[PDB]
Design an enzyme around this catalytic site. Structure first.
Site, PDB file in Angstrom:
ATOM      1  CB  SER B 116      27.261  45.187  36.860  1.00  0.00           C
ATOM      2  OG  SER B 116      27.299  45.909  35.633  1.00  0.00           O
ATOM      3  CE1 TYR B 139      32.066  43.008  35.389  1.00  0.00           C
ATOM      4  CE2 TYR B 139      30.440  44.331  34.195  1.00  0.00           C
ATOM      5  CZ  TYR B 139      31.161  44.059  35.352  1.00  0.00           C
ATOM      6  OH  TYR B 139      30.990  44.833  36.477  1.00  0.00           O
ATOM      7  CE  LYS B 177      37.434  49.965  37.356  1.00  0.00           C
ATOM      8  NZ  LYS B 177      35.993  49.733  37.644  1.00  0.00           N
TER       9      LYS B 177
HETATM   10  N1  LIG Z   1      31.530  51.631  37.263  1.00  0.00           N
HETATM   11  C1  LIG Z   1      31.842  50.667  38.320  1.00  0.00           C
HETATM   12  O1  LIG Z   1      32.783  50.952  39.085  1.00  0.00           O
HETATM   13  C2  LIG Z   1      31.054  49.324  38.471  1.00  0.00           C
HETATM   14  C3  LIG Z   1      29.854  49.139  37.771  1.00  0.00           C
HETATM   15  C4  LIG Z   1      29.185  47.922  37.929  1.00  0.00           C
HETATM   16  C5  LIG Z   1      29.694  46.923  38.762  1.00  0.00           C
HETATM   17  N2  LIG Z   1      30.846  47.123  39.425  1.00  0.00           N
HETATM   18  C6  LIG Z   1      31.335  46.047  40.309  1.00  0.00           C
HETATM   19  O2  LIG Z   1      31.924  46.555  41.464  1.00  0.00           O
HETATM   20  C7  LIG Z   1      32.969  45.640  41.924  1.00  0.00           C
HETATM   21  C8  LIG Z   1      34.157  46.419  42.123  1.00  0.00           C
HETATM   22  O3  LIG Z   1      34.573  47.049  40.973  1.00  0.00           O
HETATM   23  P1  LIG Z   1      35.759  48.043  40.942  1.00  0.00           P
HETATM   24  O4  LIG Z   1      35.298  49.323  40.277  1.00  0.00           O
HETATM   25  O5  LIG Z   1      36.253  48.296  42.317  1.00  0.00           O
HETATM   26  O6  LIG Z   1      36.904  47.405  40.109  1.00  0.00           O
HETATM   27  P2  LIG Z   1      38.274  46.900  40.713  1.00  0.00           P
HETATM   28  O7  LIG Z   1      39.163  48.079  41.172  1.00  0.00           O
HETATM   29  O8  LIG Z   1      38.958  46.175  39.559  1.00  0.00           O
HETATM   30  O9  LIG Z   1      38.044  45.987  41.983  1.00  0.00           O
HETATM   31  C9  LIG Z   1      38.197  44.641  41.951  1.00  0.00           C
HETATM   32  C10 LIG Z   1      39.417  44.133  42.605  1.00  0.00           C
HETATM   33  O10 LIG Z   1      39.235  42.831  43.071  1.00  0.00           O
HETATM   34  C11 LIG Z   1      40.158  41.998  42.453  1.00  0.00           C
HETATM   35  N3  LIG Z   1      39.478  40.732  42.246  1.00  0.00           N
HETATM   36  C12 LIG Z   1      39.092  40.207  41.070  1.00  0.00           C
HETATM   37  N4  LIG Z   1      38.458  39.036  41.270  1.00  0.00           N
HETATM   38  C13 LIG Z   1      38.437  38.811  42.597  1.00  0.00           C
HETATM   39  C14 LIG Z   1      37.917  37.782  43.390  1.00  0.00           C
HETATM   40  N5  LIG Z   1      37.258  36.678  42.755  1.00  0.00           N
HETATM   41  N6  LIG Z   1      38.048  37.836  44.729  1.00  0.00           N
HETATM   42  C15 LIG Z   1      38.672  38.886  45.292  1.00  0.00           C
HETATM   43  N7  LIG Z   1      39.182  39.903  44.573  1.00  0.00           N
HETATM   44  C16 LIG Z   1      39.081  39.886  43.225  1.00  0.00           C
HETATM   45  C17 LIG Z   1      40.524  42.727  41.229  1.00  0.00           C
HETATM   46  O11 LIG Z   1      41.820  42.372  40.775  1.00  0.00           O
HETATM   47  P3  LIG Z   1      42.056  41.502  39.439  1.00  0.00           P
HETATM   48  O12 LIG Z   1      40.878  41.603  38.501  1.00  0.00           O
HETATM   49  O13 LIG Z   1      43.301  42.033  38.757  1.00  0.00           O
HETATM   50  O14 LIG Z   1      42.237  40.066  39.825  1.00  0.00           O
HETATM   51  C18 LIG Z   1      40.499  44.082  41.623  1.00  0.00           C
HETATM   52  O15 LIG Z   1      41.676  44.488  42.266  1.00  0.00           O
HETATM   53  C19 LIG Z   1      33.071  44.615  40.851  1.00  0.00           C
HETATM   54  O16 LIG Z   1      32.485  43.432  41.250  1.00  0.00           O
HETATM   55  C20 LIG Z   1      32.394  45.205  39.691  1.00  0.00           C
HETATM   56  O17 LIG Z   1      31.838  44.287  38.900  1.00  0.00           O
HETATM   57  C21 LIG Z   1      31.525  48.291  39.304  1.00  0.00           C
END
Ligand SMILES: NC(=O)c1ccc[n+]([C@@H]2O[C@H](COP(=O)([O-])OP(=O)(O)OC[C@H]3O[C@@H](n4cnc5c(N)ncnc54)[C@H](OP(=O)(O)O)[C@@H]3O)[C@@H](O)[C@H]2O)c1
Ligand SMILES: NC(=O)c1ccc[n+]([C@@H]2O[C@H](COP(=O)([O-])OP(=O)(O)OC[C@H]3O[C@@H](n4cnc5c(N)ncnc54)[C@H](OP(=O)(O)O)[C@@H]3O)[C@@H](O)[C@H]2O)c1
Ligand SMILES: NC(=O)c1ccc[n+]([C@@H]2O[C@H](COP(=O)([O-])OP(=O)(O)OC[C@H]3O[C@@H](n4cnc5c(N)ncnc54)[C@H](OP(=O)(O)O)[C@@H]3O)[C@@H](O)[C@H]2O)c1
Lengths: 330, 330, 330
Positions: B116, B139, B177
């Site tokens: 990130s 985070y 989200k």
């Molecule tokens: N703007 C952005 O979208 C952005 C920017 C920088 C980094 N990222 C990274 O991209 C990844 C995905 O983000 P996202 O936008 O898709 O958010 P997301 O929709 O919340 O995707 C994450 C999903 O994985 C679940 N999860 C949490 N911890 C987990 C684990 N240890 N193992 C398996 N599943 C798990 C979450 O549920 P619960 O949390 O409810 O358990 C959630 O459903 C993340 O790692 C995030 O840090 C995204």
């Protein structure tokens, strides 16, 4: 080559990590508890190879998960002198310290750990001797009791055991400590917000702000730790203070005078500060009656005899420096 | 042959799963946490071999329950930047990541994981080097510390290690989200419900809406992941952004104009939108003071130098398309 | 010699008392309601012969308890445009005015009284004619209806009847008015407390802060009053504004720049202040929708033609002096 710092996210621990880093030591296992998240700021400018929660550490250390470990700086402990659950206190401080120590002795790792002057309670001598130890609270007791175990283990120990009875430690990286942060940190934020600082009033024979402690900078805590880290042939329990005791008034008067210089205003005596309401006294809390040290002063004989001969920052130098570092945000 | 996507039911992981399906890859093990049941909607148009809760997966993956695994897209993490339990953050993000990495290294499976841009914190440069990395909240620290580990594991690593520092990602499948979905998505719903959109006002010398980020559609995120998937010889920590930083004002203006255009209305400038009340500014939350990144812009140099030369959608192209996709619901 | 001022402890009334005091008139019965005690400050530097509460005044006046009375400045009214009890509003404003008017007519006393520009409602002309009068709230209606009664009584009236439709009045002695005090006063306290000022955003086709008013200093208000006091031969209902309408932004920015000039800082433009966060915009409160004048500007024709030829302080001169005076408390 591999080093372990517990309490790593904390005030003293992160300061040790930073000092290790600055002499190029970087293969470090950081152990702590980030449930209160803001501690993380302490490790942001640091170099470490792993992070573990205090609940996962011991069993993995014992197992040899981190391989060949040179030294453990065991700073991790519940440092809340007001915590009331003594069962938690004895498990989280005493028992844990014991499992860590047992794991260090089983591996030949150096074991450098934090003790506390709270152990001395209301004594008038502060010499590393059982004779004069009688802690006023269960926090001090958890430290006290581990020091007793250390004295039984030390003679038969082939690897280093060095314990440090920190006195009133102040300096950078304590921002997360809450009410357990130093008076200098408290005084700093008070003056930023209300333009005045607070200290306890009369209690148990001492005038307002006249309670005295031995204040030491973390800078000197980290220097001492590294000295014994460098001399694995020196073992023991050592006072870690300046040997020079000062009233809380000096902390307050210093913080104020340094914040005034940072804005042009000339220094004031303590009396002028009180007169102008720059320093005011809060009535001493019933909750701390009988559980509070009104005087502490490190006897320095033992530490000096072991060959740590460098001077210690005075309150004036160190607090002044600390406030300036603190002011570094605007 | 078997592929694994953690975070499978979430925003980016579900876009990955669908992208793989769109190339005949359907032997996918999906890992997420469905406690909030609405996420399931992200996998209805998908093909997967299995679903597992995040809690029962690491055991089964190391034990080799899934047979031969080519790759792991580790997208699963707690993405709530305002989550305050740092112990959970470090366990569910950092420690969990290491365990997945360890199993991947053990089985010689490719490891493509999500980092990130939060890692850079309030830095002035955005290059993949330790010297400009200073996260602002825990985070960020959990993403930061895993990246440091990857830099120590990488040289010795036989298998692929691909880590992507996503910037501000927007696009379909982020509907669950809540307060963590993109500003594009928020503005859309806001406009649909109140006839206006909101942005933060002045904070830290950036005017209202004048905070700037690098906005990248998921489409581009999903293309970059597939590229490195196809190239197991390529490993590293890569910025994933467009190289072009735009203010929040742009997103809002674009959302308003696209939504106006869908109702036969002419486009307005930002200056007209604000004067018309279609854009208003909420005062900046104190809960975000000193924890908020006011400027990001991916330095694409290292990503280019790895053979990803394809162009990125712009805010005008991507938000417009996304807003039109969103408008498909009745 | 005996003079009466209702609303004497309020904003306009206390300015009338001081101004009368300054030309030797000190035979003054003061009538107000001091329940919210702080208005008492408004009379501290004043000379009065008596003070009565509004509830006991009319009976005693009509009975002749005050002996020969030359004039009554009727400023006493409920000035809360947001008051919702319309029975109270019509009793405390309209009926009270009639009872005071009747007693004046029968005793032969001059009757100078406060009307309001609120009377015009959302009208586009601001001339003293029934055809362009349509109040938006019950406050406005209480003044509106009273004016109609004056137009019926005036033809065959033997004593002076002068009524003044004050526009947006500002100046010293309005500290007690709360949410009803002038915007210039609000901004001053907003700025002193937070280094920034607040105005309403878009409402009913007027952009953020663009709603315009006719701003008049109380010094001019007192001056027009004293003029008709001097000329019992002149009767009528007159607009009391400057003839010049500015947007609230002018007030905001003038207040900021004036406070900045006192702290040595350079003057900024409205867009500069908005970008720096010195001016922010609050969403228009639903409770005001349809009850709020977006534009007022006094037609001075009738006032001039009556003899009042003096120049009126403009916003820049008046607000600047108001701000400097206000700043005199430190
Ligand atoms: N703007 C952005 O979208 C952005 C920017 C920088 C980094 N990222 C990274 O991209 C990844 C995905 O983000 P996202 O936008 O898709 O958010 P997301 O929709 O919340 O995707 C994450 C999903 O994985 C679940 N999860 C949490 N911890 C987990 C684990 N240890 N193992 C398996 N599943 C798990 C979450 O549920 P619960 O949390 O409810 O358990 C959630 O459903 C993340 O790692 C995030 O840090 C995204
Ligand atoms: N003036 C002083 O600061 C002073 C004086 C005398 C002694 N000491 C000793 O100095 C050491 C560190 O103090 P500090 O000032 O740095 O306080 P600290 O900032 O609270 O550092 C301790 C950190 O370690 C964590 N921790 C607690 N128990 C642990 C365990 N069993 N294993 C690993 N980590 C654990 C704590 O978190 P949680 O408690 O929330 O879990 C805390 O974050 C302590 O042993 C303390 O007794 C300090
Ligand atoms: N923007 C302006 O300043 C503006 C514009 C147009 C018209 N006016 C008029 O100018 C007059 C004075 O207003 P202001 O700015 O000086 O507000 P003010 O400070 O509130 O003064 C009015 C005072 O009169 C009291 N009062 C209320 N009813 C009364 C009555 N029947 N008899 C005697 N006193 C009474 C009020 O107290 P309580 O209400 O608490 O009982 C209050 O203390 C009002 O009639 C108002 O309608 C003002």
């Amino acid at each position: 080559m591999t080093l372990i710092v517990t309490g790593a996210a904390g005030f003293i621990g992160a300061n040790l990590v930073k000092a290790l880093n600055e002499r190029g030591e970087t293969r470090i296992i950081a152990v702590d508890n980030l449930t209160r998240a803001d501690k993380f700021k302490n490790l942001v400018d640091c170099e470490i190879d792993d992070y573990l929660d205090k609940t996962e550490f011991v069993e993995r250390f014992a197992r040899g998960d981190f391989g060949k470990v040179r030294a453990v700086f065991h700073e991790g402990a519940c440092s809340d002198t007001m915590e009331t659950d003594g069962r938690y206190m004895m498990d989280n401080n005493f028992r844990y310290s014991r499992a860590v120590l047992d794991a260090c002795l089983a591996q030949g790792a150096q074991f450098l750990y934090a003790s506390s002057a709270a152990i001395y309670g209301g004594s008038s001598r502060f010499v590393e001797e059982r004779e004069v130890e009688a802690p006023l609270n269960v926090y001090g007791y958890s430290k006290f009791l581990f020091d007793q175990v250390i004295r039984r283990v030390m003679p038969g120990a082939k690897s280093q055991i060095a314990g440090f009875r920190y006195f009133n430690v102040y300096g950078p990286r304590e921002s997360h400590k809450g009410r357990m942060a130093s008076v200098a940190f408290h005084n700093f934020n008070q003056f930023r917000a209300e333009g005045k600082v607070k200290l306890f009033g009369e209690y148990s024979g001492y005038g307002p702000g006249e309670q005295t402690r031995d204040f030491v900078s973390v800078e000197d805590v980290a220097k001492v730790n590294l000295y014994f880290f460098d001399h694995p042939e020196k073992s023991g329990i050592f006072n870690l203070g300046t040997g020079r005791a000062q009233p809380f008034n000096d902390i307050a008067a210093t913080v104020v005078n340094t914040l005034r210089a940072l804005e042009g205003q000339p220094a004031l005596t303590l009396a002028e500060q009180v007169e102008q309401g720059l320093v005011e006294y809060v009535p001493f809390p019933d909750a701390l009656r009988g559980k509070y040290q009104c005087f502490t002063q490190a006897d320095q004989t033992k530490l000096r005899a072991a060959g740590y001969d460098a001077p210690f920052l005075t309150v004036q130098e160190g607090v002044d420096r600390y406030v300036r570092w603190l002011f570094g945000q605007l």
